[PDB]
Paper text:
The yeast Ty1 retrotransposon integrates upstream of genes transcribed by RNA polymerase III (Pol III). Pol III transcribes short genes encoding for untranslated RNAs such as transfer RNAs (tRNA), the 5S ribosomal RNA (rRNA) and the U6 spliceosomal RNA. Pol III is composed of 17 subunits that are organized into four architectural units. We report cryo-EM structures of Pol III in complex with IN1, revealing a 16-residue segment at the IN1 C-terminus that contacts Pol III subunits AC40 and AC19, an interaction that we validate by in vivo mutational analysis.
Maps in the presence of IN1 reveal a piece of elongated density at a crevice on the surface of subunit AC40, located between a hairpin-loop (residues 108–130) and the C-terminal helix of this subunit. We unambiguously assigned the elongated density from maps in the presence of IN1 to an IN1 segment (residues 609–625) proximal to its C-terminus. This segment contains the tethering motif of IN1 involved in Ty1 integration targeting (residues 617–622), previously identified through mutational analysis and referred to as targeting domain of Ty1 (TD1). In the structures of Pol III bound to IN1, TD1 adopts an extended conformation that includes a helical turn along the AC40 crevice and forms an intricate network of interactions with this subunit. Residues W614, M619 and L622 in IN1 establish hydrophobic contacts with P76, F315, I320 and the aliphatic chain of K316 in AC40. Additionally, R620 and S621 in IN1 establish one hydrogen bond (H-bond) each with D111 and T114 in AC40, respectively. Importantly, K617 in IN1 appears as a central residue coordinating three salt bridges with D109, D111 and E312 in AC40. The interaction between Pol III and TD1 is reinforced by contacts with subunit AC19, where residues T136 and K140 in this subunit establish an H-bond and a salt bridge with W614 and D612 in IN1, respectively. Our maps in the presence of IN1 showed no density for the rest of IN1, including functional domains for Ty1 integration that locate at the N-terminal half of the protein (NTD and CCD).
Residue numbers in the entry:
A (entry chain Q): 14 to 75, 101 to 142
B (entry chain F): 71 to 153
C (entry chain B): 1051 to 1149
D (entry chain A): 2 to 168, 175 to 332, 348 to 584
E (entry chain G): 2 to 131, 137 to 173, 189 to 212
F (entry chain D): 1 to 74, 91 to 161
G (entry chain A): 1364 to 1456
H (entry chain O): 25 to 384, 447 to 654
Write the structure that this text describes.
Amino acid sequence: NYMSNLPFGLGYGDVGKNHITEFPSIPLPINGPITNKERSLAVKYINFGKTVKDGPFYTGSMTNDGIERYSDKYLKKRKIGISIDDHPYNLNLFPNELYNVMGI
Amino acid sequence: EKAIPKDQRATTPYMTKYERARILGTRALQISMNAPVFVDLEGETDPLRIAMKELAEKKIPLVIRRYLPDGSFEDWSVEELIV
Amino acid sequence: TEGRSRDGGLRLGEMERDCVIAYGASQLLLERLMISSDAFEVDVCDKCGLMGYSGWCTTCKSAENIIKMTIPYAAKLLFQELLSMNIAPRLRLEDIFQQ
Amino acid sequence: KEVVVSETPKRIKGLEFSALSAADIVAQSEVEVSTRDLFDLEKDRAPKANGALDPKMGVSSSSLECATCHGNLASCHGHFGHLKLALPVFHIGYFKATIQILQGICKNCSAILLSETDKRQFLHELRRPGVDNLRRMGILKKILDQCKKQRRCLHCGALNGVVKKAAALKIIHDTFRWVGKKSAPEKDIWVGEWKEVLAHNPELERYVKRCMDDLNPLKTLNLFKQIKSADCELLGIDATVPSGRPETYIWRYLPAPPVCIRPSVMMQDSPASNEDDLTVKLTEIVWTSSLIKAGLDKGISINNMMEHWDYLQLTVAMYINSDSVKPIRGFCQRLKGKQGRFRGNLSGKRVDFSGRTVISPDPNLSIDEVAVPDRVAKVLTYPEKVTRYNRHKLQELIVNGPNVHPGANYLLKRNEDARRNLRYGDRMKLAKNLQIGDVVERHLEDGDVVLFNRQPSLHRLSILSHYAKIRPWRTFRLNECVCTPYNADFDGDEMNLHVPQTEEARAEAINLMGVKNNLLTPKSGEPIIAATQDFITGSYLISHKDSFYDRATLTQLLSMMS
Amino acid sequence: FILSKIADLVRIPPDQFHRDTISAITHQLNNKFANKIIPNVGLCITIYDLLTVEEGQLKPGDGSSYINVTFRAVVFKPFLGEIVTGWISKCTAEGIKVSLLGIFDDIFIPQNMLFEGCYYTPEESAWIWPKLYFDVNEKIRFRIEREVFVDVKPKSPKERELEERAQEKPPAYALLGSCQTDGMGLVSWWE
Amino acid sequence: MKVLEERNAFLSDYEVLKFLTDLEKKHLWDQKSLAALKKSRSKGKQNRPYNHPELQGITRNVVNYLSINKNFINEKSGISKMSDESFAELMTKLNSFKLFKAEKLQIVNQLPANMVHLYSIVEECDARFDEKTIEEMLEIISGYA
Amino acid sequence: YKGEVLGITRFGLSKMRDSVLQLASFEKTTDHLFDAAFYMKKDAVEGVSECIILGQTMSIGTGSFKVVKGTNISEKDLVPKRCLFESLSNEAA
Amino acid sequence: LVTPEDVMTISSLEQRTLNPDLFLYKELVKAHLGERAASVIGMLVALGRLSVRELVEKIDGMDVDSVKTTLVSLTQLRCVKYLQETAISGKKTTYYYYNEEGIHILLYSGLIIDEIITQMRVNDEEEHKQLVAEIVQNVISLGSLTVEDYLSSVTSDSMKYTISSLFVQLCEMGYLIQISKLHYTPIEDLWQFLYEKHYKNIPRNSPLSDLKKRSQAKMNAKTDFAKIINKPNELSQILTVDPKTSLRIVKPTVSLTINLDRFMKGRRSKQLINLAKTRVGSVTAQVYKIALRLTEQKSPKIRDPLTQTGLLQDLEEAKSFQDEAELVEEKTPGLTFNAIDLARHLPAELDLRGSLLSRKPHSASLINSHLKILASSNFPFLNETKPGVYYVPYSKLMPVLKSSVYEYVIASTLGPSAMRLSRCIRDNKLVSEKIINSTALMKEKDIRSTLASLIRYNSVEIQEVPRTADRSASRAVFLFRCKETHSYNFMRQNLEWNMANLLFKKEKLKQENSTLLKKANRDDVKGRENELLLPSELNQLKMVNERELNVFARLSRLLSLWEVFQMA
Ligand SMILES: [Mg+2]
Ligand SMILES: [Zn+2]
Ligand SMILES: [Zn+2]
Ligand SMILES: [Zn+2]
């Protein structure tokens, strides 16, 4: 009846609960104590990527009121973003389809 | 999506049997939903019979939209479709 | 149900369906085969074409994309049986209107 | 508050078929079923948590609560549950899919058996705007046969051969099918290995035969999880969306169906409720999964474990489709058959508001009329909505009530959700209080549109639309002129009468299927509703050249004629 | 008060085929936007007029006329430099619950952007100033700076059932004020 | 449903007043709504099966807020009596005054008779001008006062 | 009409239809369903069999056209009206 | 019991179905560049070859200008490969691959700058270290940096003079290689362009037949591919020119791109030296630290000279590629060195005096003795063709190094009986249910429990033994196998998926701390984080910053695990 099938080494208490661990657990040893070198590596990681995002290499972007407040008149501009076409590049590394976007 | 203007219309100027059946069904459903009628009932209470009388007096206020296979369409008012 | 003893209905089979199709009666097809046999008001998520309950996607857990429509309970049952196997028949929905 | 809520009518445009990834199966599932048991003696046979019939997946009766939607049998849509299987198993429905997929790649480095610049011409051809099912199958067959021919993979050349199944439901691959009189470092490795085996066995000399590259479900799943998305399109599995990964096509999670999918009958044989085949099968599958899960933590005999693991691949086979040696009704047994799912319930089903009785002749009935018994007209109804045009008539019908024929059985008020049985409730008050949006389910009346059908329904004129005429006897009477399209002969013949319930269906019926509109067969255009035997004989006898009538006889004949 | 053009599909029942279609469409648009708040667009008072009224189309089962309509509607949308005369109705020690005459009253004004010296007390004292203050249910004046549209609502049916058994962001459109400039807060501080 | 564009043409706060007044006079009169009618429409759902809930309240709240006197100080309802020609004779001052701003809707319905009020309605007002062009605007927007 | 003589058999019906539900309702339901799920087919709902199975209106006969109701709306009552403040604020620049 | 709603939100079950090659790369591009470029690179992974129109009709973004911008940003990041395929019967259009190794410059950025700081012979000076760090950070952020831009950018001419000085060193070392067409086209398409020309070059009616004409065509194609690949991989033609009365200069017009191959040679040397530091004591492990450093600069290719990825390896007479690889390894004389060559490069700190005990001052005898013990060591670190002059072999070191690293990873993963069983399954080819007992003598219960815990991965291969014609594993006992290739495969998916999980966790914490991180990374706020900040908000920023330092530390520790399994 599918219930008499049991190996001799196996028990009856262990079966029937099932479920299993929500996430399999084996504590990895690559989480060891920090060093000064590793902290500085985290720091330089932080400066990098932030460097490219503060640069013009984002291409990810997808109070916008039609009336201009007198405060917004003669107010400091946010930032003149350096355009993708503005940055000088080498033509020979880039395709012909990609030439029309750069300011030649 | 582009309506063929009324001045030129390729499809037949005759109401088909399917168009007549669907117009009668739609108008009868509208009447059964207490829509005003434009004919003399003379005691008629059946929405289908009232719709048939409306079609006879050519007074059903619906237009048939015949879509062509190319995605376009042209409109034919029930009155201007002849039986 | 299936029998005169259990007050069963008459089966409109494949041949009768074919006759009604040959007549060109779409609304009668709908009325006999859904409205008067099994008309279930299911909840369908527009994002993933999966059936929900109580206007709740219970797969996207948002209820924003849940819309309401009537399908045969046979269709509901077949979709749920397909989901029992590893077949996901996702429904893709468009507006009747907007031309 | 009171933020705007928008509803827009919608229709099903198409169906995207795929497989549910393990993420999707848990995402849809509202409970995990882990316990092999459905009821305990300690809870007095009550469905409790995590069992096969756990309430969270639905309820098997109208007097129960789901705890997921808190709905009875009439309101719960059924909710799914998921199972976690240790050591996954093959998919029976996708077995040939797995066979062809393992053909396309190499089992050594998990790289496709195709050249990175050869079949890309056919790939770009696949983006032809006009591609049919024939083109899809042909191009996929060409790709499959090309990678079947390709023995050596460009990442690791290990001579992929045949990917046939077991002589069972095991997969065996021939690593050295196309080797002969040739020497390789792989050949030296294999020869040395099997010399180390033949050096410690008095009997394995015969049994070294066969013993080729076996492909178990776990090995294939671990191989499937090594495939990059780059060559998914060649395998015909679009990996744009999640669950397009081939590894989701190996049985890892079991989506235990909702209770409504597999109902449990009440008071069957024993006072105890009777479960069904699918629930029993999933209980057994859960039991074996728990056993195999236990065997991981104790280290049971693997050969004994191989017995239980193989039974999993056998028990889920009949669970999906009982094809291996047999009354076990699987999921594909539900869908396949004359009384299955598609041909029995999807296009073709049983309908409400229909009747069937013996048919009798009636010449005084118009050819476009059918005589309906008053007894079946008092139960078959039409849902007439109250308008400004018929309110008085429907009030009279409500006053008549359900027991005299020009009456009504039910009233559905405009602002209510349940119809009022007209057996009780002082129908005079309801008739007085009729509104202009109420629905009165009134008896079938003279002139109602009914469908009328004889089996077998050979041609479309096997069903025609007639006007009802309510008569005192118990038969469906019809004019004998319209017997020919029905092929009926008043000798115990029974015909089915359908009452269309909506206005649009009623108008369609009487305008497209009406007897008067269908006097000609559509196969040739020749008339098919015309004189039958006695009508022909009487006409011939009247028009016979020896027939002379005086004025009195002639006028009586004309009066009988009209 | 600013207009805004919205495109929508209205359903005219066969009951309302007799009344002129302009009034029928406007009536349906009102019953859909009578006092409703449009998500992340503002609060709707009524419909101004109608612009594009397409021919009404019928689905094969309803019989009602479904009309694609574009319309201009009046939406109450202060942006940055708006002055209003609100009527406070509730006072709590987290920023006074300024209110209107039943239009929409869930807007809050924090104290930090309000006058610096104004502080709340557990003993229910009105205000403390270094020289004038005000009581509740009286004129006020403030500004509008930023708009946060609460457009999140992930509610599970079982959680709703528990809530109903037991029985928060009530609005999807709110306002914030300030009295950084002298004179704001009351209209009769002098003269 | 989809909103075509959020920011349409502005409203002068007399145009909305006459719009709501026209609403009330065309239908949903408040004096007649106080009156009772035992028969009603007799159709079943109100007069000519129609009713105006949740719209009468919103068209009355705004008109009441406008009909309360403008809070230039602690007689008129304040918006009732300006005619189309009354606002159409004010061009010579309204459009000759230069503000470089669409903040006109603020002074046409609120805050006359105080210098700080315009100081808030237009920001940085005194630095932009603080010599003599600060009182005739007051006198004229209080011309209706 | 496909360029070759295709019979009316199970193999012939797999001509250009791609309608997995229609094919299942004809014959060989489970193999076609599993093939569609594995290949991730995206068949539309256009067949009368699929329309019936899904409870949709078929596009044949009375469903081969649309019924439309003329709104009878003139063009003089659709232009924007009672608007001068925007023109004032425009000329004010 | 865990709720299905509870899992897949804290359990990360939906991430477990993600393919690591798509998942990690998409996450890296999403974190660094943007969401649109991430979608582009993810779709390029999902479909290897596609045009711009394929992006237009397969992604939500359909605009032509916007996809142009995002694709040119991706190409400038050296993350995309292109090729212009010509259809002679009509208009031709270019396709687009994706650069697998180009995104490592993004990933290895911190490691790349760590080694640019650590490696240099002159690093004590604080200013020089900081400027070289800045220059490498700029070159990796910009892709191809040009001295034409940089020299005009710098304000001080003497500062400009050091800039041109560092570059010649950076190009000799190999950290800066002249970017060209070779860094944007697929290997197999290069091979097909070189393979078709030599098939069209043959005049008709030759006495030879197809077999030998194809032989000569593939031979000539291999030769010309080797030439065209060996010209720019190592070269100094940019820096060769020297103007009158001036220092040596590089070409300023050309673009300088930071390379990766020699950096990974340095990382591999670092991992081998770390192995030695673990393997042998610091007296001669400190010696070995530089022994590879004098051969790492011109060390040969690590996995494939790109003549193995662009073409099918071989069918009959397959050993040719391995034979020629080891042949070149033995032929190259520069890689071979003598003890006299290593005496000039040893630092003053090392003494090499008490390092040897012959029986139970930079002396060329003793370094030669370390070199003999290295070559005589069980692991083949060095080979001795002629007395005294040895060389580093890779024809046999790679399989054993891969075995050791994978096996000790499995050991760190499982229990001691499990590593013992794996060791037996490895050394003993084709073990069985009784051969395990004969070769183990351990407790069968725990042996089999660990065996079951080890079947889950691709660690040991199972077999079916049919006693009858029909194959049933239950009827008769079954044997085991090795199949190490699947094991080396597994260490790619699991580790890549784990790295992708770390990147996902970091980006998700960023997503839920966006406003705090924005108020953090502001110029006037920077260096002043303890004043203009609320108490609780400051504490929150502090703890989340420690959390991301922790995630970066774990990321860095994991980054010493996958480059080894990325070899051949
Ligand atoms: Mg008979
Ligand atoms: Zn969904
Ligand atoms: Zn439920
Ligand atoms: Zn391979």
